[PDB]
């Protein structure tokens, strides 16, 4: 009757307190994990300066990884890159080739094993519990070069700002399969570089492409972690707004029920007293 609305008010009030605390928690996490995102942006520059950027390559095998989140109050991030994953994957699979879809974060294994299920071989999680390190991303890249595809698509949300998260695809051509072929311009463009390695160019390109996969995978999950924090900071602001709006309507409903309660109890007392007096 009139106690259920008061306990629902007491529910939504500390739900709003919870989400107001969670917004500042995610905001402090976004502020602390911004400098690492700014530092890791440097090392992805020389590899796309050297190897270029060729997303629409015709390959035989491609490992596509979608870097999702771990906990799921982000509010429209892990489904937006699932949409972007299928949108960039239908673009680049019309050669009759095999495609391996991977997800980093266990909110992507819940969203990717029902839309592309039989092409889903690997699921990685818990990468944001302590922090994101380069040895962790190098091990993840080692399980990515367990199989040897001709491309590595990395789907992640680039932390452009605290408001805007542009989803970014990044591609890594494996060396002898696609990289030595996709650089030929009347000869080659890589032949301008004087290889100063121990063994031949076919091995220094192998080391360079594995290191480029590790570098952009580390930067991808770091950018996606910062976008997770900055999207949770906005989703919890929306939850405070909604649980203040719901609380404001439910307060008026409780006031109407309270006024009607005193009126009906008083009318009952007057109707009892008018039968006797």
């Amino acid at each position: 009757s009139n106690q259920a609305v008061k306990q629902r008010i007491r529910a939504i009030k500390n739900i709003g307190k919870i989400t107001k605390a969670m917004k500042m928690v995610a905001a402090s996490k976004m502020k602390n994990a911004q400098i690492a995102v700014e530092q890791s942006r440097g090392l992805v520059d020389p590899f796309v300066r050297l190897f270029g950027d060729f997303p629409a390559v015709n390959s035989n095998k491609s490992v596509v990884v979608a870097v999702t989140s771990d906990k799921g109050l982000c509010g429209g991030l892990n489904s937006n890159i699932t949409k972007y994953t299928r949108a960039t994957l239908a673009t680049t699979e019309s050669e009759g080739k095999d495609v391996v879809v991977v997800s980093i974060g266990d909110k992507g294994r819940s969203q990717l094993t029902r839309i592309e299920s039989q092409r889903y071989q690997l699921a990685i999680a818990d990468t944001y519990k302590v922090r994101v390190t380069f040895g962790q991303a190098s091990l993840i890249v080692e399980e990515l070069i367990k199989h040897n595809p001709q491309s590595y698509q990395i789907l992640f949300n680039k932390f452009r700002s605290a408001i805007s998260f542009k989803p970014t695809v990044a591609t890594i051509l494996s060396p002898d399969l696609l990289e030595k072929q996709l650089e030929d311009v009347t000869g080659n463009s890589l032949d301008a570089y004087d290889i100063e390695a121990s063994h031949e160019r076919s091995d220094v390109l192998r080391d360079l492409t594995e290191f480029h996969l590790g570098v952009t995978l580390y930067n991808a999950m770091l950018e996606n972690n910062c976008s997770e924090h900055a999207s949770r900071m906005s989703a919890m602001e929306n939850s405070t707004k909604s649980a203040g709006e719901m609380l404001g309507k439910l307060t008026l409903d409780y006031n109407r029920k309270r006024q009607a309660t005193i009126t009906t109890e008083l009318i009952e007392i007057i109707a009892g007293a008018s039968a006797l007096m």
Binding site: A36, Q39, S40, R41, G42, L43, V44, D45, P46, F47, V48, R49, L50, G52, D53, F54, P55, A56, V57, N58, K83, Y84, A87, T88, A90, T91, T92, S94, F134, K158, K166, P167, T168, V169, A170, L182, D184, V185, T186, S189, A192, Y193, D194, I195, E196, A197, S198, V204, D207, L208, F211, V215, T216, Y218, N219
Partner: protein, 177 residues
């Protein structure tokens, strides 16, 4: 042969054919990089821009005139307009030069590119300068490394990397002028 012109602007039209018009086109990492390799410039004299990178820290994006890198065929100096190279670095000391002033970082490996537009890029994984490393544990680490040698291939490759890095670090700590 260049009969397949892949790229970011060629990806956009195939994405406008096969992916729907509900979503804006995804970004690419070449949209965030203002400096390329073949687009000429950046030298303008005797200096040339350096890019000393670790995965966790940007160590220098200033403009130096001499860069000393520890390549696997030995040390080599990079002056203003070097030949374009891709130099695999061994453990050694990278030395930056601004003139009278110098920065001497000891790196752990990695690569170093010189590009046809005169820019250079040093891509290491851990670059600790020489006051941050102690000379007491490098000899303890080499004595714990070069003595116990497993004949297994993975452990002996790790041991070869250990004795190479610790020997270069021992030869680098007392060779400060």
């Amino acid at each position: 042969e260049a009969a397949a012109p892949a790229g970011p602007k060629e990806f956009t039209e195939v994405w406008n054919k096969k992916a729907p018009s509900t979503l804006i086109v995804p970004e690419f990492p070449s949209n965030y990089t203002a400096v390329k390799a073949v687009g000429e410039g950046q030298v303008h004299g005797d200096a040339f821009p350096v890019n000393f990178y670790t995965p966790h820290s940007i160590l220098s994006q200033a403009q130096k005139d001499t860069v000393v890198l520890p390549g696997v065929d030995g040390y080599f100096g990079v002056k203003a307009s070097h030949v374009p190279t891709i130099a695999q670095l061994k453990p050694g000391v990278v030395e930056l030069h601004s003139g009278a002033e110098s920065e001497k970082f000891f790196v752990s490996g990695g690569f170093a590119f010189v590009h046809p537009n005169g820019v250079t890029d040093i891509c290491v994984l851990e670059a600790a300068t020489l006051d941050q490393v102690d000379p007491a544990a490098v000899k303890s680490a080499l004595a714990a490394a070069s003595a116990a040698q497993p004949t297994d291939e993975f452990e002996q490759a790790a041991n070869r990397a250990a004795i190479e890095l610790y020997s270069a670090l021992e030869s680098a700590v007392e060779a400060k002028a």
